Amino acid sequence: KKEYTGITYISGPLLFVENAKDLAYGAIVDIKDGTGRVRGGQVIEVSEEYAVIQVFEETTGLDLATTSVSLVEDVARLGVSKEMLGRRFNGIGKPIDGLPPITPEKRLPITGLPLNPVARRKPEQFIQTGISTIDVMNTLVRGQKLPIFSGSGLPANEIAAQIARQATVRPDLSGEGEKEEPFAVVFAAMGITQRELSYFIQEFERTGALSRSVLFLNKADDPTIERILTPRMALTVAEYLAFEHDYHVLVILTDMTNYCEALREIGAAREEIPGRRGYPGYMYTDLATIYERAGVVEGKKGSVTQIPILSMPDDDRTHPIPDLTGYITEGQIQLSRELHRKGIYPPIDPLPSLSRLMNNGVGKGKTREDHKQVSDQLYSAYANGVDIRKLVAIIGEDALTENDRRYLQFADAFERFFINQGQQNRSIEESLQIAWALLSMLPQGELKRISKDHIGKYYGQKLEEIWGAP
Amino acid sequence: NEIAAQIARQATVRPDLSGEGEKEEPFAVVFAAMGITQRELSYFIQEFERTGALSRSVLFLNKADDPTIERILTPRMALTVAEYLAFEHDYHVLVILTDMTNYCEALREIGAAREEIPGRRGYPGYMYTDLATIYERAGVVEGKKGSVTQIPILSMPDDDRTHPIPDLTGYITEGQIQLSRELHRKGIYPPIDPLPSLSRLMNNGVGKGKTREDHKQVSDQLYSAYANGVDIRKLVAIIGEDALTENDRRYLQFADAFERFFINQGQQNRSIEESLQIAWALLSMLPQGELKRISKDHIGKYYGQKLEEIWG
Amino acid sequence: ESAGELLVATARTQARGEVLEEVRRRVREALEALPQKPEWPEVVRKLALEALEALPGAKALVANPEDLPHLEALARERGVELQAEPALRLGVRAVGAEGKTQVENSLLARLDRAWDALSSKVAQALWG
Amino acid sequence: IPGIRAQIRFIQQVLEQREREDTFRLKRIKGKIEAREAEEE
Amino acid sequence: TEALLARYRERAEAEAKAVREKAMARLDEAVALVLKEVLP
Amino acid sequence: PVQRKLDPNTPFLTGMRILDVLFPVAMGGTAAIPGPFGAGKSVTQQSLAKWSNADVVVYVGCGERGNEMTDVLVEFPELTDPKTGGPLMHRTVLIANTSNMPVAAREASIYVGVTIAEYFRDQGFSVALMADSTSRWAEALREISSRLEEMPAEEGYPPYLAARLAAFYERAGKVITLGGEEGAVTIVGAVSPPGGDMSEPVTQSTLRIVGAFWRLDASLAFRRHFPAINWNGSYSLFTSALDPWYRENVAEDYPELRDAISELLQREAGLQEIVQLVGPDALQDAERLVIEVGRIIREDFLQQNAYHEVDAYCSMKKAYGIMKMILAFYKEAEAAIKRGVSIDEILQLPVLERIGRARYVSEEEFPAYFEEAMKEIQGAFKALA
Amino acid sequence: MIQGVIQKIAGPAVIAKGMLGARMYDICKVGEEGLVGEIIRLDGDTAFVQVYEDTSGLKVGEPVVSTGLPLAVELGPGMLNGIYDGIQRPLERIREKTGIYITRGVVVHALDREKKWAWTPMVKPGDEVRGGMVLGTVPEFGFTHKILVPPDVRGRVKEVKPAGEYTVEEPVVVLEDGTELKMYHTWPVRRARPVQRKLDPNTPFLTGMRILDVLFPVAMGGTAAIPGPFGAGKSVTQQSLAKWSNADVVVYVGCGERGNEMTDVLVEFPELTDPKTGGPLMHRTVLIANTSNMPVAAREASIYVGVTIAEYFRDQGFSVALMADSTSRWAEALREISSRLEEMPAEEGYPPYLAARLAAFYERAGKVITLGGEEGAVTIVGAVSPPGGDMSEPVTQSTLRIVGAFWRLDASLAFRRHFPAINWNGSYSLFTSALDPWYRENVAEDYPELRDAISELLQREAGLQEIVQLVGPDALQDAERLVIEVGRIIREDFLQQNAYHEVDAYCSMKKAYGIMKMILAFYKEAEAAIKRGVSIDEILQLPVLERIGRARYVSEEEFPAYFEEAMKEIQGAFKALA
Ligand SMILES: Nc1ncnc2c1ncn2[C@@H]1O[C@H](COP(=O)(O)OP(=O)(O)OP(=O)(O)O)[C@@H](O)[C@H]1O
Ligand SMILES: Nc1ncnc2c1ncn2[C@@H]1O[C@H](COP(=O)(O)OP(=O)(O)O)[C@@H](O)[C@H]1O
Ligand SMILES: [Mg+2]
Incomplete structure (x- = not known):
C-alpha cells in the first residue's frame, strides 16, 4: 500500500503531486480526501518534479493538507470472461445491474494491439438484420464497418435497438458447412440521458x-x-469473445459525436493546441484506433462487425466527424428527415446509402442467386420515380406518359411497403419476395438490369406485404 | 446624428391623451461625445443653439x-450626472451617447494591453458586463417623479449586424432603430427600416387611455403588409411583373407608397393622429378582407380614406 | 424464450456471489482474530521488514503500542523511529524521509488488494 | 449558380482567416504565460 | 403464460441451491488457500 | 438524492397550441428554446409561467433586463392562479439577477433555482423551472476562466462547459421521493446564440441532451408572426410516450389528426421549393390547394396572440376541434377539386372566415360553435355540388 | 553510444537527460522495451525524442540509448517478393513470431540473414573501385542481382571472395584500408542517391492502355497524378499498370488505407501472373503496406522508403515503376505530426512546407546515368484522394504544379460501362511536344497529326452536345449526325478497352496508329460521299464499320494483315456503296 501525500496545486480537473516518480504514465490512481470519500483519477504527465493527475469527477472537497493519492493499476485493464453475457456495466467495468461481480478469466489492456495486415482475410458472408432497406439494398457483410448517419431528432436509438434485437447469422443458406456458431452483440452507448437509458434497458429486457x-x-x-x-472496453470484450471462443460478434457504438466532443474536452484540458474547427489534430488516428479493430482473421472462425452511429451536427456531411468516418469506414446508412416526418419507419433513405463490400457477401452460395441484380433494379427504378414525382407537380398528372404513371405507382408503393416495414422482422427471402412483388408493377422489358431467366422465374406476383409473404 | 437631433428637438409627451398631467417640462439633455469629429460636433452645437x-x-x-x-x-460621468438630476431633482433627462463603437475600441485597447484573453475579434471577454454597467443606468423609480431615457448611437462596421458590438448592445438594450442604406440611397429620410427595428416596451405605452385604441392592430397590419410587399419584390425579381396577379400588384404598390410616404417625411413634425391617419390611408389601398389583424369595427370606423386627400 | 432462462442465469450468478461473499467474510474474520495469538509478533516482524525495505530511507515507523516491544529490537538496528498509534490495527506504516510518501502492509488491506487475483483460484477450487 | 459559389468561397475564406487569428493569439498568450511562469519563477 | 415463468424460477432455485451446496463442501479449503496466499 | 427514476408519461400543459400539439413536452422532460434577440423567448416563458398545470413555478432571471424584470414583479400579483383562483405570486418563486449585478451571482443563480425546485419536488409537487438565458451564464463561466488564465476550448469557453450543462439539465425528471411520494421537475431553458448562429457551442451542447427543441425563426419574427416557431427546425421526442394519455383524455383519434397535420405541413414545405423556383401560378390545382391549406394552418392555427384575453390560453379540446375542422375542410376540398372546380373559387367561400375566427371563441362557447362549424362545412360543398 | 535516462513523459513526447552529444533526427530506443524514437530538438543535456509507438506504462528513470544514425533502409538481395510496413519490417516474420497482433517493440531484420546466395565475383585483387561500381552478381527469380559498392566508398581492392554459397552478412570484399563490403549497405531515406547525370525524358512509358498512351502519354522518368473516386476502376487501372508496363521492377506503396482495401491488394496480387514469363507477378514486386491504425511515423516514412528502394533498383540498371496508393493519407499524417509539434498551421491545417516535401519526393523520379555508367529510370504515379473531390484543395493544387500529366478519373463513364473511365476533358499531358520526335522516328512521320485529328474530332463531337440534349440525335443534319456517329465510333472502338481479355488488355502503339488511320480514312471518305450525295443512315450499315469495331481482339502479329484488309475494304466500300 503505497500512497502519496503532498499535493502542491489543485485547479480545474488537474492536481499536481510531488515525489511521484514511481507512477507510470497513464496509471489509474485513487484520490481520498479528509471526509473519506474516494475519487478516481488518471496520470497524464510524469516528471522528476511532479506528476499531473486528471480527476474523473468534481473536486469540491479537496484540500492541500489532507488529500492523499494511491495507485490502482499501472495501465487500465478489464477482467473478461464468457460469463459476461447478460450483464450491464457503467463504462469502466463496474456493474450496474445489481448482480454480483464476475470472476475474470484474464485481465487485458483495453488499448488493443493492431492487427497484422497479412493475417487478415476477405469478408465473405452476410448478417441478416431484418430490415429490407438494409439487407437487400445495402447488405451488411461480416467484418465490415458500416456507420449510420442520423440527424438531430431522427429515431436512431430505436433503429439501433431493433437491429440489436433482430440481427442473426444464417448458416442455413451457406449451402455447405450448414451449422451455426454462437452469436453475440456488444452494445456500447456513450453520453446518453436517463430517458434513453430507461428505454434501452426496457427494450433489451x-x-x-x-x-x-x-x-x-x-x-x-x-x-x-x-x-x-x-x-x-466494448471492443476489448468483442475481440476477446470473437477470437477466443469463435463467437460471431456485432458491435454497436452509439452517438460517436458524443465521443468526439468528450475527446475535444479532454484535449483542451491537457492544454493542447486545437486543430481545425476546434478538434484535436490526432482525431483521425484516434478514430482509426477504434474503427480498425474489426474484421476477420485467417485460421479463425470468429468475426467482428461494427455499426457506428453518429448524429450529423448541422446535417452537414462536411463536418469533420462524418468526414473522417467516411474516410475510415466502408459506406454509410442515411436516415431521411422527410421520410421520418411522413410517418415511415425505419426512415432509411436508399438513394444516398451505400455498402462498399456488398458485392462480395451476396450472390449464389451466400444468398439467393438474384440478389445484386434485384438491388440494382430497385435503386434505378426508385431514382427514376423520384424525379417524376417532382415533374408531376408542374406538368400535371394528365400530361404523363404511361411509363411515368407506372413509375409513380412504384415509388409510392415502394415507400409504403418496402421501407415502411414497422417493427416486424423480415427474413431475406421474405424481403426478396416483397421486392419481386414491387418490381412486378413495372412492365416486363423495362427491367434492364435483370437477366432474363431471373425475370422468368420471379416476375408476375401481386403484393405480398398484405399477404405477409407466405 | 440628424435623426438624434430631430428626436431631441421634437420629443414631447401627450398629457391630454393620457387624461392626466399638464404642461410637462421640456426634456433635459445630457450629451456625451466619444471620439467625435469636428464636423459632427459643430453640427450638433449649431443645432442645439x-x-x-x-x-x-x-x-x-x-x-x-x-x-x-x-x-x-x-x-x-454623463450617466452619473443624469441619474443625480433625475432622481434628486425630478428632472426628465434624455441621454445621447454619440458612438459606443469608439468606447468599445478604447476598451479593447486597454484589455489587449493587459495581455487579457480575447473573447471574439480581439474584444475582451468582459465586454458584455462592461456595456451592461453603462446601459442599465436608466429607467423610472417607484415613488419618484424623475426619469432617465437613453438613446445610444453606434456604427455597425460594414453594416454587419453580427458584429460583437451591435450583438451585445442588442442583447442588453430594449430594442433598436436600424437604419438601412438602401432607403438612404433612394433619397428617403429618415432611412429607418421597419422590419429589423424593434421596441420591447411598446405594449406598455399604447391602447385605451394612452393613445388611440387601434394603435397595436394598425402596427401589426402595416408590418404584415410591408413584409408581403418585400416578398413580392423578391418574386418579381424572377418571374417578371406581367405574370403577377392583382393581389401581388396591389401589395407591390402598397410597398412603394409606404416607402415614399410613411417613411420619407423630411424635417416635418407629425403628431400621433396625423401618423395614424397616414397609416390608415395607406392601408385603405388593400382589399377590406385582407386586413385580418384589425377588428371589424375599427375598419368600419376608419377604413376608406384616400391618400391624395391628406396633402394640401 | 430467453428471458425465462435469464432468471436461471441471474439466480445462479447470485448464488455464486453469496458463496463467494461467505468465503470473503470468513477469511476477513480469520485475519481479524489473529493478533491475540502468540504468532502475531512473528508476523509484525515480517510486515514491518517488508514495508521498511519497500521504502528506501524511511524516517520513522508507526505501530500499535502492543507491537512496539517486538519491533523496538528490530527498529533500533534498522535505525528508524517507532511511534504508537491507536489506529493502524493489525498493520504497520512507514513514512518517507521527506514525510510526503507512505507505505502500509496490513492483512485487511492485502486481502482487498489480492482478492482480484484470488477470485479465479477460489472459483476453480470451489467448482472444480 | 456562379454568384452563389463566389459567396460561399468568400464566406469560407473569412471563417478560416478568423480561426487562424484566434489560434495564433491563443498560442502567443500561452507561450508568454509559460515563459513567465517557468523561466522567471 | 405464468407456467413457463414458474418452471424457470423453480429450475433456477434448484440450480442455485445445488451450486451453494457444492461450494459449502469446499468453503474450508477456499478459506485455507486465501489465508495462505494473503499472509506473508 | 431520490429513490427511483420513472418514465415520463404525462403531458406538461403549456397553453400554446403549437407547443402542446406539434412538439409536446412530458411532465419530467426538458426543453430548449433558442433564438436571436427579438424572437420571443421571454414572452413564451412568461406565458408558460402564467398558464400551466404545474403546482409551483420557479423563474430564474439570469442576466435579465431590469425593466423586463420589474414587469413580472408588477403584473404577477394581479393575475390569478388557474388551478385554485388565488393570486399567481402565491405559487411562484422569482430569482432575479440583472445584467449590472455581479457576474458570479449570475453564475450561481441557476444552481440556487434548481435546488429550490428539487426541494419543492421532494415535498411532492410538480415543479416547472424557467431559465431565462443559459448563454448569459456561459458568458460568466468564460469571464471567470479568462480571469484564471485558463486555456480555452472554443470561442473562449472553458472545456468543462458541456459537463456543467449536462449536470444542470440532468436534474430534471419524474422521481419517487425518499418518502415514497411522486414529484417531478420540468426544465425549460433558453439560449441566445451570437447573431442567431445555431452552430454556437452552447447551442450544440444543449441540443445533445434535451428531449424537446423549440427553434425560433428570425424571418417569422421580423414580419411579426408569433410565436415564430421554426417548424422545420424543431422536434420533440415525447410524442410516442404521451399517446396513451391523449387517447383517454382528449380523443381516440388525436394521434391520427396530429400525424395528418404534420404530413400536410411536410408536403407544403416540399412544394415550397417549386413555389420559389417557378412561382405559384405554374403549380397544378391540387398543389395550389395544398399551399392554401398550409397557409391557412399557419395563419389560423399555429399563430397565437399572447396578449388577447381569449387567445392567450387554449385547452387541448379547442386545438383538437380546430384541427378536425381544418382536416374536414381539406377532405371536402379534395373531393371538390376532383369534381372539376378550380382554386380561387373555393378560396372565397364564406366558411373560411368562420374557421379563421375560431381561435377567438371563449372556452365555454367552443363545444357548440365547433358543432355548427362542422355542420356549415359539410353543408357548403355538397350544396355547391 | 550516447546513453541517458528519461526525466519527463507526456503523451508521445519523451524528454531525456544525460544525452549530451546526440545528433539531430537520429533513431533512439526508449525504455527497457526499446521503443524506437526520433530526436527532434536538442537543448543543454536534454533531447526531445518522439516515440513512434504508444508510451503507456513507461516510468521516469528508464534508460535511453541512441543508435547514432538517422532513419534508413537496408538495400540488398532479398527485397523482392517481400511485404514491408512503413519502416521496412517484414510482416511475415512478425506474424510467425508474435501471432496475429503486432506487439510493441518487435525486432526483425529487413533482409533475411539466413538465406544462402550463389556468389559470383566480378572484380579482381588490386583493381580500383569507386562508389557505384559492380562487385558481383547473385541470381534472384531470374534477375541477376548486382552487388554495388556504396556510393561514398572508394579505394583499391585487397581480397575478394571466390564463387560459392554465402549468406547476406558475410564480408565479400575487403579493401586496403580494412573496410569490408558485404551484400548490403544502408542509406538514409531522406537523402537522394547520387547519379552521374539526369537525362531529360525523351522516350514514352508504354502503360498498356490506348487512351493513356496516345492522348495523355507520360515519358520514362515522368510523373502523373490520378484521383481516387469510388467505383471508377482506380484499383484495376493500377493493377493493369503493374501487370503490363514496360517497367522491370514494380514498387507498390500503401500509406494508410483502410484495412479491407489493403487486404484486397495483398490477396489479389499473389494470384496474378506477369505475362512476360508466366511466373508469379509477386517475384518482381515489393509491397509496402500501412493501415490507418499504424503509428503515424511509419505512414509518414512509407513513401520515402518506397522511393529509396526504387532508386536502388534504378542504380542496378533496371527500370522501376512506383505507385502511391493515396498521397492524401500521407498528407493527413504529415498534418497530424505538424499538429503534434505545435507548429503554426498554414492553410486548412497543412504545414507551410507541404509543397517543398511534395516537390522533393516527386523530383527523385527521372531517367539518369548511374554512377556505374549504365542507364536507369524511375516512374512515379501518385494518387490523390481529395475530401469532396474538390481540386481546389491545397494538396491537389500543390501536386498539379509539379506533375507532367494529369489523368482525371470519373465515375460517370464507369456507370456508363466505359472502361477505363478517364475523361478526355480536363485531363492533360505536358510530354507530347517533347515526345513528338520519338513518335516521328519510331511509329510514323504523320502520327502526331493523326492524333491531333482524333483530338479535333472528339472536341467537335463535344461541341454540339446541347442540341442532342435539347432535341435528339435523329433530328439532325447529315454532317452533324455523321460527326456524332464518328465520335461514338471513336469512343467504342479506340478509347474503350477491356483488361480481362487475353489479347485486348495490351495494345502497342502501331495498333492504335492503325485504328486512328482507319477511322480518319473512313471519316474522310464519308465526307466525300455526302459531298457527292448520300444519306448517313445508308452509311450506318457499311461492313467496314463492323470491321473497324472488330479490329480489336486480334493478335499483334496478326494485326498488319488485318490493317491492310481493312484499308482496302474502306477504299472499295465507299465507292461501290454510295
Ligand atoms: N478497365 C476495366 N475493364 C473491365 N472492368 C473494369 C475496368 N475497370 C473497372 N472495371 C469493373 O469495375 C470493378 C472494380 O472497379 P470499380 O470501378 O468498381 O472501382 P475500384 O477499382 O474498386 O476503385 P476504388 O478503389 O477507387 O473505389 C471490376 O471488378 C470490373 O467489374
Ligand atoms: N406571442 C406574442 N405575442 C405578442 N408579442 C410577442 C409575442 N412573442 C414575442 N412578442 C414580441 O416580441 C418582442 C420581443 O419579445 P421577447 O419575447 O422579449 O424576445 P426575446 O426575449 O426572445 O429576445 C416584444 O415586443 C414582444 O411583444
Ligand atoms: Mg429577453
Missing part, C-alpha cells in the same frame, strides 16, 4: 435479447474520461 | 484628437 449481449452504458452526466474509455 | 436648448444641456466632449483612454470615463 422485454424480448430476451439481454442474455446474448453485453451492455456498456455511460450517461451524459458521467465523467468524460469514462466516455472516452467505454468504446475501448 | 438654434433650438435654444443649451441652457438645459450638460455637455461632455471627447474629440477625436483627444487621448483615447479618457473615453472609459465619459459615459459613466
Whole structure:
C-alpha cells in the first residue's frame, strides 16, 4: 500500500503531486480526501518534479493538507470472461445491474494491439438484420464497418435497438458447412440521458435479447474520461469473445459525436493546441484506433462487425466527424428527415446509402442467386420515380406518359411497403419476395438490369406485404 | 446624428391623451461625445443653439484628437450626472451617447494591453458586463417623479449586424432603430427600416387611455403588409411583373407608397393622429378582407380614406 | 424464450456471489482474530521488514503500542523511529524521509488488494 | 449558380482567416504565460 | 403464460441451491488457500 | 438524492397550441428554446409561467433586463392562479439577477433555482423551472476562466462547459421521493446564440441532451408572426410516450389528426421549393390547394396572440376541434377539386372566415360553435355540388 | 553510444537527460522495451525524442540509448517478393513470431540473414573501385542481382571472395584500408542517391492502355497524378499498370488505407501472373503496406522508403515503376505530426512546407546515368484522394504544379460501362511536344497529326452536345449526325478497352496508329460521299464499320494483315456503296 501525500496545486480537473516518480504514465490512481470519500483519477504527465493527475469527477472537497493519492493499476485493464453475457456495466467495468461481480478469466489492456495486415482475410458472408432497406439494398457483410448517419431528432436509438434485437447469422443458406456458431452483440452507448437509458434497458429486457449481449452504458452526466474509455472496453470484450471462443460478434457504438466532443474536452484540458474547427489534430488516428479493430482473421472462425452511429451536427456531411468516418469506414446508412416526418419507419433513405463490400457477401452460395441484380433494379427504378414525382407537380398528372404513371405507382408503393416495414422482422427471402412483388408493377422489358431467366422465374406476383409473404 | 437631433428637438409627451398631467417640462439633455469629429460636433452645437436648448444641456466632449483612454470615463460621468438630476431633482433627462463603437475600441485597447484573453475579434471577454454597467443606468423609480431615457448611437462596421458590438448592445438594450442604406440611397429620410427595428416596451405605452385604441392592430397590419410587399419584390425579381396577379400588384404598390410616404417625411413634425391617419390611408389601398389583424369595427370606423386627400 | 432462462442465469450468478461473499467474510474474520495469538509478533516482524525495505530511507515507523516491544529490537538496528498509534490495527506504516510518501502492509488491506487475483483460484477450487 | 459559389468561397475564406487569428493569439498568450511562469519563477 | 415463468424460477432455485451446496463442501479449503496466499 | 427514476408519461400543459400539439413536452422532460434577440423567448416563458398545470413555478432571471424584470414583479400579483383562483405570486418563486449585478451571482443563480425546485419536488409537487438565458451564464463561466488564465476550448469557453450543462439539465425528471411520494421537475431553458448562429457551442451542447427543441425563426419574427416557431427546425421526442394519455383524455383519434397535420405541413414545405423556383401560378390545382391549406394552418392555427384575453390560453379540446375542422375542410376540398372546380373559387367561400375566427371563441362557447362549424362545412360543398 | 535516462513523459513526447552529444533526427530506443524514437530538438543535456509507438506504462528513470544514425533502409538481395510496413519490417516474420497482433517493440531484420546466395565475383585483387561500381552478381527469380559498392566508398581492392554459397552478412570484399563490403549497405531515406547525370525524358512509358498512351502519354522518368473516386476502376487501372508496363521492377506503396482495401491488394496480387514469363507477378514486386491504425511515423516514412528502394533498383540498371496508393493519407499524417509539434498551421491545417516535401519526393523520379555508367529510370504515379473531390484543395493544387500529366478519373463513364473511365476533358499531358520526335522516328512521320485529328474530332463531337440534349440525335443534319456517329465510333472502338481479355488488355502503339488511320480514312471518305450525295443512315450499315469495331481482339502479329484488309475494304466500300 503505497500512497502519496503532498499535493502542491489543485485547479480545474488537474492536481499536481510531488515525489511521484514511481507512477507510470497513464496509471489509474485513487484520490481520498479528509471526509473519506474516494475519487478516481488518471496520470497524464510524469516528471522528476511532479506528476499531473486528471480527476474523473468534481473536486469540491479537496484540500492541500489532507488529500492523499494511491495507485490502482499501472495501465487500465478489464477482467473478461464468457460469463459476461447478460450483464450491464457503467463504462469502466463496474456493474450496474445489481448482480454480483464476475470472476475474470484474464485481465487485458483495453488499448488493443493492431492487427497484422497479412493475417487478415476477405469478408465473405452476410448478417441478416431484418430490415429490407438494409439487407437487400445495402447488405451488411461480416467484418465490415458500416456507420449510420442520423440527424438531430431522427429515431436512431430505436433503429439501433431493433437491429440489436433482430440481427442473426444464417448458416442455413451457406449451402455447405450448414451449422451455426454462437452469436453475440456488444452494445456500447456513450453520453446518453436517463430517458434513453430507461428505454434501452426496457427494450433489451422485454424480448430476451439481454442474455446474448453485453451492455456498456455511460450517461451524459458521467465523467468524460469514462466516455472516452467505454468504446475501448466494448471492443476489448468483442475481440476477446470473437477470437477466443469463435463467437460471431456485432458491435454497436452509439452517438460517436458524443465521443468526439468528450475527446475535444479532454484535449483542451491537457492544454493542447486545437486543430481545425476546434478538434484535436490526432482525431483521425484516434478514430482509426477504434474503427480498425474489426474484421476477420485467417485460421479463425470468429468475426467482428461494427455499426457506428453518429448524429450529423448541422446535417452537414462536411463536418469533420462524418468526414473522417467516411474516410475510415466502408459506406454509410442515411436516415431521411422527410421520410421520418411522413410517418415511415425505419426512415432509411436508399438513394444516398451505400455498402462498399456488398458485392462480395451476396450472390449464389451466400444468398439467393438474384440478389445484386434485384438491388440494382430497385435503386434505378426508385431514382427514376423520384424525379417524376417532382415533374408531376408542374406538368400535371394528365400530361404523363404511361411509363411515368407506372413509375409513380412504384415509388409510392415502394415507400409504403418496402421501407415502411414497422417493427416486424423480415427474413431475406421474405424481403426478396416483397421486392419481386414491387418490381412486378413495372412492365416486363423495362427491367434492364435483370437477366432474363431471373425475370422468368420471379416476375408476375401481386403484393405480398398484405399477404405477409407466405 | 440628424435623426438624434430631430428626436431631441421634437420629443414631447401627450398629457391630454393620457387624461392626466399638464404642461410637462421640456426634456433635459445630457450629451456625451466619444471620439467625435469636428464636423459632427459643430453640427450638433449649431443645432442645439438654434433650438435654444443649451441652457438645459450638460455637455461632455471627447474629440477625436483627444487621448483615447479618457473615453472609459465619459459615459459613466454623463450617466452619473443624469441619474443625480433625475432622481434628486425630478428632472426628465434624455441621454445621447454619440458612438459606443469608439468606447468599445478604447476598451479593447486597454484589455489587449493587459495581455487579457480575447473573447471574439480581439474584444475582451468582459465586454458584455462592461456595456451592461453603462446601459442599465436608466429607467423610472417607484415613488419618484424623475426619469432617465437613453438613446445610444453606434456604427455597425460594414453594416454587419453580427458584429460583437451591435450583438451585445442588442442583447442588453430594449430594442433598436436600424437604419438601412438602401432607403438612404433612394433619397428617403429618415432611412429607418421597419422590419429589423424593434421596441420591447411598446405594449406598455399604447391602447385605451394612452393613445388611440387601434394603435397595436394598425402596427401589426402595416408590418404584415410591408413584409408581403418585400416578398413580392423578391418574386418579381424572377418571374417578371406581367405574370403577377392583382393581389401581388396591389401589395407591390402598397410597398412603394409606404416607402415614399410613411417613411420619407423630411424635417416635418407629425403628431400621433396625423401618423395614424397616414397609416390608415395607406392601408385603405388593400382589399377590406385582407386586413385580418384589425377588428371589424375599427375598419368600419376608419377604413376608406384616400391618400391624395391628406396633402394640401 | 430467453428471458425465462435469464432468471436461471441471474439466480445462479447470485448464488455464486453469496458463496463467494461467505468465503470473503470468513477469511476477513480469520485475519481479524489473529493478533491475540502468540504468532502475531512473528508476523509484525515480517510486515514491518517488508514495508521498511519497500521504502528506501524511511524516517520513522508507526505501530500499535502492543507491537512496539517486538519491533523496538528490530527498529533500533534498522535505525528508524517507532511511534504508537491507536489506529493502524493489525498493520504497520512507514513514512518517507521527506514525510510526503507512505507505505502500509496490513492483512485487511492485502486481502482487498489480492482478492482480484484470488477470485479465479477460489472459483476453480470451489467448482472444480 | 456562379454568384452563389463566389459567396460561399468568400464566406469560407473569412471563417478560416478568423480561426487562424484566434489560434495564433491563443498560442502567443500561452507561450508568454509559460515563459513567465517557468523561466522567471 | 405464468407456467413457463414458474418452471424457470423453480429450475433456477434448484440450480442455485445445488451450486451453494457444492461450494459449502469446499468453503474450508477456499478459506485455507486465501489465508495462505494473503499472509506473508 | 431520490429513490427511483420513472418514465415520463404525462403531458406538461403549456397553453400554446403549437407547443402542446406539434412538439409536446412530458411532465419530467426538458426543453430548449433558442433564438436571436427579438424572437420571443421571454414572452413564451412568461406565458408558460402564467398558464400551466404545474403546482409551483420557479423563474430564474439570469442576466435579465431590469425593466423586463420589474414587469413580472408588477403584473404577477394581479393575475390569478388557474388551478385554485388565488393570486399567481402565491405559487411562484422569482430569482432575479440583472445584467449590472455581479457576474458570479449570475453564475450561481441557476444552481440556487434548481435546488429550490428539487426541494419543492421532494415535498411532492410538480415543479416547472424557467431559465431565462443559459448563454448569459456561459458568458460568466468564460469571464471567470479568462480571469484564471485558463486555456480555452472554443470561442473562449472553458472545456468543462458541456459537463456543467449536462449536470444542470440532468436534474430534471419524474422521481419517487425518499418518502415514497411522486414529484417531478420540468426544465425549460433558453439560449441566445451570437447573431442567431445555431452552430454556437452552447447551442450544440444543449441540443445533445434535451428531449424537446423549440427553434425560433428570425424571418417569422421580423414580419411579426408569433410565436415564430421554426417548424422545420424543431422536434420533440415525447410524442410516442404521451399517446396513451391523449387517447383517454382528449380523443381516440388525436394521434391520427396530429400525424395528418404534420404530413400536410411536410408536403407544403416540399412544394415550397417549386413555389420559389417557378412561382405559384405554374403549380397544378391540387398543389395550389395544398399551399392554401398550409397557409391557412399557419395563419389560423399555429399563430397565437399572447396578449388577447381569449387567445392567450387554449385547452387541448379547442386545438383538437380546430384541427378536425381544418382536416374536414381539406377532405371536402379534395373531393371538390376532383369534381372539376378550380382554386380561387373555393378560396372565397364564406366558411373560411368562420374557421379563421375560431381561435377567438371563449372556452365555454367552443363545444357548440365547433358543432355548427362542422355542420356549415359539410353543408357548403355538397350544396355547391 | 550516447546513453541517458528519461526525466519527463507526456503523451508521445519523451524528454531525456544525460544525452549530451546526440545528433539531430537520429533513431533512439526508449525504455527497457526499446521503443524506437526520433530526436527532434536538442537543448543543454536534454533531447526531445518522439516515440513512434504508444508510451503507456513507461516510468521516469528508464534508460535511453541512441543508435547514432538517422532513419534508413537496408538495400540488398532479398527485397523482392517481400511485404514491408512503413519502416521496412517484414510482416511475415512478425506474424510467425508474435501471432496475429503486432506487439510493441518487435525486432526483425529487413533482409533475411539466413538465406544462402550463389556468389559470383566480378572484380579482381588490386583493381580500383569507386562508389557505384559492380562487385558481383547473385541470381534472384531470374534477375541477376548486382552487388554495388556504396556510393561514398572508394579505394583499391585487397581480397575478394571466390564463387560459392554465402549468406547476406558475410564480408565479400575487403579493401586496403580494412573496410569490408558485404551484400548490403544502408542509406538514409531522406537523402537522394547520387547519379552521374539526369537525362531529360525523351522516350514514352508504354502503360498498356490506348487512351493513356496516345492522348495523355507520360515519358520514362515522368510523373502523373490520378484521383481516387469510388467505383471508377482506380484499383484495376493500377493493377493493369503493374501487370503490363514496360517497367522491370514494380514498387507498390500503401500509406494508410483502410484495412479491407489493403487486404484486397495483398490477396489479389499473389494470384496474378506477369505475362512476360508466366511466373508469379509477386517475384518482381515489393509491397509496402500501412493501415490507418499504424503509428503515424511509419505512414509518414512509407513513401520515402518506397522511393529509396526504387532508386536502388534504378542504380542496378533496371527500370522501376512506383505507385502511391493515396498521397492524401500521407498528407493527413504529415498534418497530424505538424499538429503534434505545435507548429503554426498554414492553410486548412497543412504545414507551410507541404509543397517543398511534395516537390522533393516527386523530383527523385527521372531517367539518369548511374554512377556505374549504365542507364536507369524511375516512374512515379501518385494518387490523390481529395475530401469532396474538390481540386481546389491545397494538396491537389500543390501536386498539379509539379506533375507532367494529369489523368482525371470519373465515375460517370464507369456507370456508363466505359472502361477505363478517364475523361478526355480536363485531363492533360505536358510530354507530347517533347515526345513528338520519338513518335516521328519510331511509329510514323504523320502520327502526331493523326492524333491531333482524333483530338479535333472528339472536341467537335463535344461541341454540339446541347442540341442532342435539347432535341435528339435523329433530328439532325447529315454532317452533324455523321460527326456524332464518328465520335461514338471513336469512343467504342479506340478509347474503350477491356483488361480481362487475353489479347485486348495490351495494345502497342502501331495498333492504335492503325485504328486512328482507319477511322480518319473512313471519316474522310464519308465526307466525300455526302459531298457527292448520300444519306448517313445508308452509311450506318457499311461492313467496314463492323470491321473497324472488330479490329480489336486480334493478335499483334496478326494485326498488319488485318490493317491492310481493312484499308482496302474502306477504299472499295465507299465507292461501290454510295
Ligand atoms: N478497365 C476495366 N475493364 C473491365 N472492368 C473494369 C475496368 N475497370 C473497372 N472495371 C469493373 O469495375 C470493378 C472494380 O472497379 P470499380 O470501378 O468498381 O472501382 P475500384 O477499382 O474498386 O476503385 P476504388 O478503389 O477507387 O473505389 C471490376 O471488378 C470490373 O467489374
Ligand atoms: N406571442 C406574442 N405575442 C405578442 N408579442 C410577442 C409575442 N412573442 C414575442 N412578442 C414580441 O416580441 C418582442 C420581443 O419579445 P421577447 O419575447 O422579449 O424576445 P426575446 O426575449 O426572445 O429576445 C416584444 O415586443 C414582444 O411583444
Ligand atoms: Mg429577453
